[PDB]
Design a protein around this ligand. Structure first.
Ligand SMILES: NC(=O)c1ccc[n+]([C@@H]2O[C@H](COP(=O)([O-])OP(=O)(O)OC[C@H]3O[C@@H](n4cnc5c(N)ncnc54)[C@H](OP(=O)(O)O)[C@@H]3O)[C@@H](O)[C@H]2O)c1
Ligand SMILES: NC(=O)c1ccc[n+]([C@@H]2O[C@H](COP(=O)([O-])OP(=O)(O)OC[C@H]3O[C@@H](n4cnc5c(N)ncnc54)[C@H](OP(=O)(O)O)[C@@H]3O)[C@@H](O)[C@H]2O)c1
Ligand SMILES: Nc1nc(=O)c2c(CCc3ccc(C(=O)N[C@@H](CCC(=O)O)C(=O)O)cc3)c[nH]c2[nH]1
Ligand SMILES: Nc1nc(=O)c2c(CCc3ccc(C(=O)N[C@@H](CCC(=O)O)C(=O)O)cc3)c[nH]c2[nH]1
Ligand SMILES: Nc1nc(=O)c2c(CCc3ccc(C(=O)N[C@@H](CCC(=O)O)C(=O)O)cc3)c[nH]c2[nH]1
Ligand SMILES: Nc1nc(=O)c2c(CCc3ccc(C(=O)N[C@@H](CCC(=O)O)C(=O)O)cc3)c[nH]c2[nH]1
Ligand SMILES: O=c1ccn([C@H]2C[C@H](O)[C@@H](COP(=O)(O)O)O2)c(=O)[nH]1
Ligand SMILES: O=c1ccn([C@H]2C[C@H](O)[C@@H](COP(=O)(O)O)O2)c(=O)[nH]1
Lengths: 503, 503
């Protein structure tokens, strides 16, 4: 029945609730970037094929209803053979018309010189294509938001897997990315091996994040790869906590903050806790009760009585963490008494200083906030892990680099990535700047023994498109941001993964 | 004469003075790594070819004398067809013998089933092969030392170019790498382009280091690639000095210090100046005269009367640079008076504390020397560029990571790379540790406009194998190293490239 009708390639854009159409129209506001991706995907002809037949084109196939879903401004689709399937219309300007798919494909491959056939919907057509195994490859644009609709993309069969994932992009109404699914059952020159000067037979690593994904452009892969690399090649070392960890040294990640917000999607990350922690840093607090009071418990264990006493801090009030981040950001050099003291106008307000300098002298090469106050180290419950960051301006875009001396990959690193991304966005906004990159340096990167099963599970999870960040555009000063001013939209994630903190 | 005798592939190992042989023996102590490279290169059969004939072997061709040059025990060379050329010997146990090359190649390619033919010398044979254009590819082990000898490798014709370079390796007696030359005249799927989500036709970068080199495993490539990247994509910005610079933010380089010493070879680097400056940091000096007195002038322009005056240091004695590196390394938190004050027992001796912590608690995750003393910045003639570094120990190897806020890629970066490599080796030695990696994080990395021609010239230069470092093993304390205790052996470099410093 469908003899000769296979290897049909689908292009579709699909909302989170699988909706693809609403009142015969696209359900979301137009994403022209998606239109260009579709155009580029469906027009491509390999160089070899094109030099032999230079007039050769691909085919696009639609139901009639989808065909009207398109303007005249862009119709019939330029440089491709347009084909419409329909039992009620006989003729359409610019197109070939067939009564059914099996006739169409047969006629096409027998009688119409073309390169590749693409399937552009709608549901009727997609459903026929998938129920009958006629598709070997899907180009799918994933939108991280639900839209009202009445037309849906069918579930993709378990016979398919994701093999490519673009970077996450965003408009101001949705975050999205592009992926490729391929049917599983049809999905290294020697000099390269020799010229390493090392073993020509190098056994593949023990741990590989998402082995089936061959094009790995989602920024989350940086974090997943590092996890895989420390599990594969990390050395188990004792450490101060008394819970051992597999450790490796030296990594650099970067995130394009103009495109998306790098809140990990491979587990549900406690965003509320990250935001309260940052606002806590900004206002200069070193009182752990300020976080507890807001139902954030991430700093509880390093301020507990037994932890303080274990480390010689026998005169320290519980949850007085000492002159850590908040104190150094706002009062570097001031004498730390305790977490209740008035430090107003005492020490150096690095945070204020550097924001003002970004405004007045963007090309300054010393835009640094440093929490590694060597004189204060002995007073600290836990010396800063993210101990140093530096801003940078070019082309009216702010970037930030942070140095992290000690990186708990399971627990803290995901917090750190998201925290500095927000800080950069805040700083960019109060300075009237666009968004560049967050560059994250890992020095001692490790995975605690009791997180191994957690992270093994995690790195097998396919990333969702990252979410996007919106700050209240009215906030003019970094000290004014409240939690309601900091909104992460379109966060799609896998389930939370419990991991215990080693104090 | 030589019809059907082309595409013969050479393997040779060559001393810096082109010597390959001495008294019919190898002129250097044996490098078993080189033998292993040779054996792997000459025994490889492509998997496709091997399945069709699972007994197929390659050919190795020698002169009589070169055969006589290998132990009778290691011979005939295993898993290959051994061929000897000779006019004075007719039969050799388990080898083929020919009277001349042309006959040999013809007989072999017509009558002896085999995969690929290799040429293993000596000079008579290499010369005949090169003089007659019979070679399309050369596997060449470069040694950075001259050896006595009486047999030489001919000059390689300018019809060849280097297309592959291994990482630099070393024994205790020589620095070396592997390279491939290929004859010039005969030397990515669309999904990869589409799945970036950006412009599918990418204008190739304007600058590329060593475009001819396809396998780029020499660590110097990190530095050359970064030069090429900043030239290509960096933004022209003004800065403190009044000479503009192309600038790009965020890189990470690493150097395996157990293998070689990363003193750049694409220009002759002023190593003596690097050592004196480091010894100057170590002893804690902030007096620029201490450097001038050793005929090192790198800090002179930043301590000069006019520079001090124009930065408001009108009361500062000339070449009193203020509480910069030496002071922070040894006395962080002491009150800086001037460069003549006695600071003995004042402030925190970070350098001493970290070296002692490496000895007593190698798994500590706070092994940091921080020169970004925020309290002292306003006193400094030039706030530290390499402002923060951190050590790490695993598998009995010391690694180091440095954060450089501002990176004069033309002048200072080459100094910083070698400086921290020496410092790491020194610290490793006094703590009885082996050598791991130096990891170099660059924040604002830039190229001054007046260095563009210089660096454009530099990035087309093919790197030599890096040199190696030897410290005097008697030195037990970091303060005891003197210039004569720190020896760089086997430094081979292209000419110096003049570059002017912007103050
Ligand atoms: N977001 C996306 O990626 C995407 C992609 C495509 C479409 N859409 C949206 O989806 C909607 C259109 O889809 P839809 O499911 O409502 O309609 P559709 O599938 O485009 O068209 C339905 C009609 O096409 C004809 N047809 C389809 N398969 C046929 C076959 N095998 N043989 C004969 N005729 C066939 C029949 O028309 P007759 O009445 O002539 O028999 C059928 O009633 C629009 O809202 C559009 O914007 C979205
Ligand atoms: N480091 C390296 O990569 C390397 C590589 C190879 C060799 N080597 C060194 O080089 C030295 C040996 O080389 P070498 O140049 O002295 O000698 P060689 O070229 O190995 O052999 C000399 C003899 O080979 C014969 N021969 C070469 N080409 C011939 C041709 N076309 N037709 C007939 N006979 C031919 C002659 O034969 P008869 O005299 O027998 O008639 C000649 O006297 C040794 O010291 C060895 O260790 C070093
Ligand atoms: N990924 C994806 N997104 C979609 O919206 C979609 C559709 C919806 C129908 C549709 C088809 C073409 C264009 C259309 O206008 N196409 C123009 C693009 C305009 C341009 O960028 O120049 C074209 O030339 O293809 C607009 C809408 C089917 N398959 C799709 N797949
Ligand atoms: N060993 C160690 N690792 C660290 O990263 C760390 C920190 C960084 C802050 C931190 C601490 C705990 C959690 C954390 O527990 N997060 C959990 C729960 C989050 C929540 O429910 O709010 C998580 O699953 O992400 C997340 C972040 C302080 N002390 C630490 N000590
Ligand atoms: N790069 C290079 N280095 C050289 O020394 C060399 C030579 C010198 C002659 C020569 C040939 C083979 C071996 C020899 O013993 N080969 C053994 C090595 C055994 C092993 O290490 O396992 C082999 O099996 O090839 C040792 C010396 C020719 N071409 C060369 N090219
Ligand atoms: N703009 C700027 N860039 C810097 O890197 C820097 C420094 C770092 C130290 C430094 C200064 C000059 C040279 C240097 O001049 N090197 C020359 C000559 C070396 C010699 O012969 O001693 C070189 O060609 O490498 C190399 C290193 C202080 N102030 C600076 N200001
Ligand atoms: O913001 C933070 C703070 C701490 N840590 C981690 C690193 C270590 O796992 C632990 C601190 O222990 P030390 O490195 O100080 O020993 O907490 C983070 O990952 N991010
Ligand atoms: O060890 C050093 C010291 C300085 N610089 C460079 C960076 C800048 O080009 C210049 C210092 O100027 P500012 O970044 O402070 O403006 O010196 C280095 O590259 N390495």
């Amino acid at each position: 029945s469908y003899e000769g009708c296979g290897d049909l390639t689908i292009f579709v854009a699909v909302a989170l609730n699988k909706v693809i159409g609403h009142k015969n129209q696209i359900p979301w506001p137009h994403i022209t970037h998606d239109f260009r991706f579709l155009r580029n995907g469906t027009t491509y002809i390999p160089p070899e094929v094109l030099s032999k037949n230079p007039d050769i084109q691909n085919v696009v196939i639609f139901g009639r209803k989808t065909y009207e879903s398109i303007p005249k401004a862009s119709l019939p689709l330029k440089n491709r053979i347009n084909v419409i399937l329909s039992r009620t219309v006989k003729e359409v300007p610019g197109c070939l018309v067939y009564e059914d798919l099996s006739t169409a494909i047969r006629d096409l491959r027998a009688n119409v010189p073309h390169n590749k056939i693409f399937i552009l919907g709608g549901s009727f057509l997609y459903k026929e294509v998938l129920d009958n195994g006629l598709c070997d490859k899907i180009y799918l644009t994933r939108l991280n938001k639900e839209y009202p609709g009445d037309t849906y993309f069918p579930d993709i069969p378990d016979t398919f897997e994701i093999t490519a994932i673009s970077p996450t992009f965003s408009t101001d109404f949705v975050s999205y990315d592009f992926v490729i699914y391929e049917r599983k059952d049809c999905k290294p020159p020697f000099d390269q091996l020799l010229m390493t000067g090392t073993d020509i037979s190098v056994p593949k690593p023990k741990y590989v994040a998402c082995p089936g994904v061959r094009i790995r452009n989602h920024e989350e892969f940086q974090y997943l790869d590092i996890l895989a690399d420390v599990l594969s090649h990390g050395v188990l070392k004792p450490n101060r906590t008394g819970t051992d960890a597999y450790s490796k040294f030296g990594y650099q990640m970067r995130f394009d903050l103009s495109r998306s917000f790098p809140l990990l999607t491979t587990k549900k990350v406690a965003l509320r806790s990250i935001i309260e922690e940052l606002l806590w840093f900004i206002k200069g607090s070193t009182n752990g009760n300020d976080l507890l009071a807001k139902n954030v418990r991430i700093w509880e264990l390093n301020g507990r009585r037994d932890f303080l006493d274990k480390n010689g801090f026998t005169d320290r009030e519980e949850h007085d963490l000492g002159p850590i981040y908040g104190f150094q950001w706002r009062h570097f050099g001031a004498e730390y008494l305790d977490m209740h003291a008035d430090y107003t106008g005492k020490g150096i307000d690095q945070l204020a200083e550097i924001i003002n300098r970004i405004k007045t002298n963007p090309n300054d090469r010393r835009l640094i906030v440093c929490s590694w106050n060597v004189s204060d180290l002995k007073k600290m419950a836990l010396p800063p892990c993210h101990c140093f960051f530096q801003f940078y301006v070019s082309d009216n875009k702010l970037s930030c680099m942070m140095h992290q001396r000690s990186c708990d990959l399971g627990l803290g690193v995901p917090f750190n990535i998201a925290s500095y991304s927000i800080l950069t966005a805040m700083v960019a906004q109060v300075c009237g700047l666009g968004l560049g990159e967050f560059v994250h340096n890992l020095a001692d990167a490790h995975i605690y023994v009791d997180h191994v099963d957690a992270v093994t599970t995690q790195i097998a999870r396919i990333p969702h498109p990252f979410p996007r960040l919106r700050l209240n555009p009215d906030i003019r000063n970094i000290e004014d941001f409240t939690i309601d001013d900091i909104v992460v939209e379109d966060y799609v994630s896998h389930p939370p993964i419990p991991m215990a903190m080693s104090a």
